[PDB]
Design a protein around this ligand. Structure first.
Ligand SMILES: CCCn1cnc2c1c(=O)[nH]c(=O)n2C
Ligand SMILES: CCCn1cnc2c1c(=O)[nH]c(=O)n2C
Lengths: 108, 107
């Protein structure tokens, strides 16, 4: 438990989990359910908000930046895999701007 | 602000001389790099040289305002290039440096 992991839990993760564009990221990418067969060929390190929150809630992270990186690989997985015109990409951009805003006022 | 100076003098410093930074020091010239559809795909181009001229003319109004530019830069790269391209790895390496350097930004 660090002041940054605490800020990532109660400020960042609280803002992003309840957001109206959060629902595609609240759980891992189910490639058979979403009809995306190539996904785990293109995206070798999947990541999603449900995993990040359990880890914050479970003391999994040690230095916050590791949690910041899990957020970042989540967003980039979406930009890398999906078409540029896909609504999902715009939803990833909107959640990300918020993440960046909130980390901009983070301590230590 | 001090945040804009930290982003100019610690954050932009550490990414600019990186060995993977050269594709991002100056705007994408679509015709030289062999990417003609670039501007159909990328509606808001961005590059560290633009963020740099803006950092030293006090263009930015907040730290986040400038961190957004950095983010658009990395995101154009992921969106435009094929997942297998070496520039995708370069952006991720540069981007992870930015996030750790931003984490320890004052206030
Ligand atoms: C709204 C599109 C369905 N969907 C849900 N989750 C997704 C996707 C997708 O097409 N691409 C993705 O990357 N993820 C995480
Ligand atoms: C290293 C590949 C050529 N190249 C140089 N700069 C680039 C690219 C590219 O393929 N895609 C880009 O986005 N930029 C900025």
């Amino acid at each position: 438990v660090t002041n940054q992991l605490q800020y990532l839990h109660k400020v960042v993760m609280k803002a992003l989990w309840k957001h109206q564009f959060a629902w595609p990221f609240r759980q891992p990418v189910d490639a058979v359910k979403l009809g995306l067969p190539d996904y785990h060929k293109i995206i070798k390190q999947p990541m999603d908000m449900g995993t990040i929150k359990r880890r914050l809630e479970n003391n999994y992270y040690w230095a916050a930046s590791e949690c910041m990186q899990d957020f970042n690989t989540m967003f980039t997985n979406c930009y890398i895999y999906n078409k540029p015109t896909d609504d999902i990409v715009l939803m990833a951009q909107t959640l990300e701007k918020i993440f960046l805003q909130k980390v901009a006022s983070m301590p230590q």
